[PDB]
Homo-oligomer: A and B are copies of this chain.
Amino acid sequence: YQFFDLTQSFCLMAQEALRRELTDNGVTFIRGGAWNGTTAGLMAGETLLLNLAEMEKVWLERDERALEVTRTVSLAQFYQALSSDNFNLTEKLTQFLREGKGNVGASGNELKLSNRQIEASVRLSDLKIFSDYPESLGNTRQLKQVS
Total copies of this chain within the assembly: 5
Q: Which among B6, B10, B13 is the interface contact of A50 at CB below 8 angstroms?
A: B6
**A53 within 8 Å of B by Cβ?**
yes
Query: Which of A3, A7, A10, A46 has the most C-beta atoms of chain B within 10 angstroms of its own C-beta?
Result: A3
In residues 3-40 of chain A, which contact B (Cβ within 8 Å)?
3, 6-7, 9-10, 13, 23
Q: Say yes or no for A126: interface residue by CB 8 A criterion.
A: no
Q: Which residues of B contact A81 (CB under 8 A)?
A: none
The verdict on A117 contacting chain B, using a C-beta distance below 8 Å, is yes
Which chain B residues border A7 with CB–CB below 8 Å? 53
Tell yes or no: A54 within 8 A of B by CB.
yes
Q: A residues engaging B (CB < 8 A)?
A: 2-3, 6-7, 9-10, 13, 23, 46, 49-50, 53-54, 57, 60, 117, 134, 140, 142
Jot down 18 A-B pairs with beta carbons below 8 A, ordered by A.
A2-B50, A2-B54, A3-B46, A3-B49, A3-B50, A3-B53, A6-B50, A6-B53, A6-B54, A6-B57, A7-B53, A9-B57, A10-B57, A10-B60, A13-B60, A23-B140, A23-B142, A117-B134
Known: A3-B50, A10-B60. 16 other contacts (CB 8 A): A2-B50, A2-B54, A3-B46, A3-B49, A3-B53, A6-B50, A6-B53, A6-B54, A6-B57, A7-B53, A9-B57, A10-B57, A13-B60, A23-B140, A23-B142, A117-B134
